[PDB]
Amino acid sequence: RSVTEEDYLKIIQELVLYKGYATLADISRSLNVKRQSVRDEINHLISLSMAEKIERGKYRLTPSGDREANRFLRKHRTAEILLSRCIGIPWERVDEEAMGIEHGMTEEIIQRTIERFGVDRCPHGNPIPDPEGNVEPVADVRITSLLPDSTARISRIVYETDDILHFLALNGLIPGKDIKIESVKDTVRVLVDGRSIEIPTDIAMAIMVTVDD
Amino acid sequence: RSVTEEDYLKIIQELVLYKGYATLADISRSLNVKRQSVRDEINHLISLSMAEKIERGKYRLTPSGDREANRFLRKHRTAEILLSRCIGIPWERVDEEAMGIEHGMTEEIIQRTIERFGVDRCPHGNPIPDPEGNVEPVADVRITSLLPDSTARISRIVYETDDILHFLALNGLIPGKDIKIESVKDTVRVLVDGRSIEIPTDIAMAIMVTVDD
Ligand SMILES: [Fe+2]
Ligand SMILES: [Fe+2]
Ligand SMILES: [Fe+2]
Ligand SMILES: [Fe+2]
């Protein structure tokens, strides 16, 4: 697939949940689009009241751009469920592979997929928005906000890159797994499945967790 | 989805297998596109050596247009298998619903779907072409070419409209079912599952069968 508006909405929403803002160069690098085209699209989104400038070089979605993103992510996330549950596309690959089929996911397909597998989250734990673009508020927090000896459950991975998902899969840090914070100096080190894992800051920033209970 | 070149290739291939040719008005009606746009696309296909005029008002694909159609139908037919086997989209609806997700079916998805379900035909029995656009020749014939008392097995439905598939499903005339020709005057009447069914000519023309054995 070549790049669409919906791809811009998704990456901008991810970067904002991940680090608090989207830059042109971060969008350029994720979408593999030249900066100047990224600039034209951002300005177009701003003129449509779907994005706004936060300060210099830093952007985010407006509330209405966020709902539009959400209507797309309903398609995206359901496509991931379809691909991973029906045909065994690996957990860490399924974000990339959903890219083809997601644009044409109809409500017929989306709803039958949701009811057939009994899910309301993508395999990476992000909730599936409703058709209007609403998502239920989830009570979770950044794993980087936790003190040593905190116990928690991994909730969702808000930014789904290859390096990130591969690390998480390799170390079994997946939605639903109980973890315990061992250390927070330089990296975030946790206890999971009796094993100890150092999570570098760039990866830890993408991990949301729910604190018991 | 709005209309693409691939949609033109598919309907033209179907109409040719069905009645021996495609007219502008038949393409217009199937794709819901005004005749003039259908005309521009046909001329474009002709200039690309993907279609040719047979005689007045009658068109078909060239060999190379047929292979291109086939590369698309690999996507289409696999999408149908995915949708009907993974999530239970009804047999008679699955041709329409594949329309969204088919354009982005990658070889990764296509191949894992084929191996996961163990299929080399769509639910309506049409073979799944290979990535290059080849299909294995199938030894089947039109049900309208058969004499009374012939026995056969339904092979494929080469033209998949709503009226056609609905009739076939309603009367259990599906790939694999054994049938016996009872009569060929006005309609084609067959014996299937101990029941007798009159198949009108417009529907019978789309049914291929293999004569035993
Ligand atoms: Fe994703
Ligand atoms: Fe996901
Ligand atoms: Fe079909
Ligand atoms: Fe089919």
CA B124 to chain centre: 8
Residue located via tokens 């949609």: B7
* Contact assignment for A87 to B86 by CB distance below 8 Å: yes
Q: Judge whether B80 is annotated as a binding position.
A: yes
The first and second tokens of residue B65, run together, are 């247009």
**CB within 8 Å of A6: residues ≥ 6 apart:** A69, A72, A103
Interface test with A, best of B101, B105, B112, B119 (most A CBs within 10 A): B101
**What is the C-alpha end-to-end distance of chain B, expressed in Å?**
42
Q: Is B92 exposed, middle or buried (0-12, 13-18, 19+ CB in 10 A)?
A: buried
Computed on alpha carbons and rounded to an integer, the radius of gyration of chain A in Å comes to 17
CB contacts of B99 in chain A (<8 Å) are 104
State how far the Cα of B186 lies from the Cα of B174, in Å rounded to an integer. 22
Please list, residue by residue across A71-89, b when 16 or more beta carbons sit within 10 angstroms of its beta carbon and e when fewer do: bbbbbbbbbbbbbbbbbeb
Q: What is the 3-state secondary structure (H, E, C) of chain B?
A: CCCCHHHHHHHHHHHHHHHCCECHHHHHHHHCCCHHHHHHHHHHHHHCCCEEEEECCEEEECHHHHHHHHHHHHHHHHHHHHHHHHHCCCCCCHHHHHHHHHHHCCHHHHHHHHHHHCCCECCCCCECCCCCCCCCCCCCEEHHHCCCCCEEEEEEECCCCHHHHHHHHHCCCCCCCEEEEEECCCCEEEEECCEEEEECHHHHCCEEEEECC
Residue A19: strand, helix, or coil: helix
Residues facing residue B110 across a β-bridge: none
The first and second tokens of residue A167, run together, are 């690390």
Q: Which of A83, A103, A105 sits opposite B109 (nearest CB)?
A: A83
CB contacts of B85 in chain A (<8 Å) are 86
Strand order in the sheet with B195-199: B141-142, B207-211, B151-157, B178-183, B188-192, B195-199
Whether A38 contacts A1, CB under 8 Å = no
Shortest Cα–Cα distance, A22 to chain B (Å): 27
Q: Which residues are found with C-beta within 5 Å of the ion, ligand 1?
A: A 95, 160
Q: Is B16 exposed, middle or buried (0-12, 13-18, 19+ CB in 10 A)?
A: buried
State how far the Cα of B50 lies from the Cα of B13, in Å rounded to an integer. 11
Check CB contact of A118 with chain B, cutoff 8 Å.
no
Estimate the crossing angle of helix A94-101 against helix B94-101, to 10 degrees: 120
Residues facing residue B53 across a β-bridge: B59
Please list, residue by residue across A14-35, b when 16 or more beta carbons sit within 10 angstroms of its beta carbon and e when fewer do: bbbbbeebbbbebbbebbebee
Whether B20 contacts B144, CB under 8 Å = no
Among the bound ligands, the one closest to the CA of B96: 3
Q: What is the 3-state secondary structure (H, E, C) of A174-194?
A: CCCCEEEEEECCCCEEEEECC
CA distances from B70 to A188, B9, B114, B128, B157 (A): 52, 9, 16, 8, 16
φ, ψ for residue B152, nearest 5 deg: -160, 175
Whether B158 contacts B75, CB under 8 Å = no
Q: What secondary structure letter does DSSP report for A118?
A: T
CB contacts of A88 in chain B (<8 Å) are 112, 116
Q: Which of A82, A101, A109 sits opposite B105 (nearest CB)?
A: A101
Domains parsed from chain A with CATH numbers: 1-70 (1.10.10.10), 71-136 (1.10.60.10), 137-213 (2.30.30.90)
Residue A22: strand, helix, or coil: strand
Q: What is the 3-state secondary structure (H, E, C) of A64-115?
A: HHHHHHHHHHHHHHHHHHHHHHHHCCCCCCHHHHHHHHHHHCCHHHHHHHHH
The first and second tokens of residue A188, run together, are 């975030």
Residue located via tokens 């949940």: A17
The first and second tokens of residue A179, run together, are 């973890």
Closest alpha carbon to A200 in A212, A211, A184:
A184
Q: Is the peptide bond before A40 cis (omega within 30 degrees of 0)?
A: no
Closest alpha carbon to B91 in B201, B173, B179, B196:
B173
State how far the Cα of A81 lies from the Cα of B116, in Å rounded to an integer. 16
State how far the Cα of A94 lies from the Cα of A78, in Å rounded to an integer. 11
Measured torsion, CA atoms of residues A91, A96, A100, A104, in degrees rounded to the nearest 10:
70
Residue A133: strand, helix, or coil: coil
Query: How many angstroms is the resolution?
Result: 2.3
User: Beta-carbon neighbour count of residue A52 at 10 Å?
Assistant: 13
Closest alpha carbon to A62 in A76, A86, A45:
A45
Estimate the crossing angle of helix B94-101 against helix B63-81, to 10 degrees: 100
Computed on alpha carbons and rounded to an integer, the radius of gyration of chain B in Å comes to 17
Check CB contact of A82 with chain B, cutoff 8 Å.
yes
State how far the Cα of A79 lies from the Cα of A93, in Å rounded to an integer. 12
Experimental method: X-ray
φ, ψ for residue B58, nearest 5 deg: -120, 130
Q: Which of B1, B86, B89 sits opposite A104 (nearest CB)?
A: B1
Check CB contact of B102 with chain A, cutoff 8 Å.
yes
Please give the helix or strand (H or E) that residue A34 lies within, else none.
none
Shortest Cα–Cα distance, B116 to chain A (Å): 6
**CB < 8 Å & 24+ apart, contacts of A107-113:** A107/A131, A108/B89, A108/B97, A109/A78, A109/A82, A109/B83, A109/B87, A109/B89, A109/B97, A109/B100, A109/B101, A110/A74, A110/A75, A110/A78, A112/B87, A112/B88, A112/B89, A113/A78, A113/A81, A113/A82, A113/B86, A113/B87
CB contacts of A105 in chain B (<8 Å) are 100-101
Q: Which residue of A has its CA nearest to B85?
A: A86
- What is the whole-number distance in angstroms between the Cα of residue B208 and the centre of ligand 2? 43
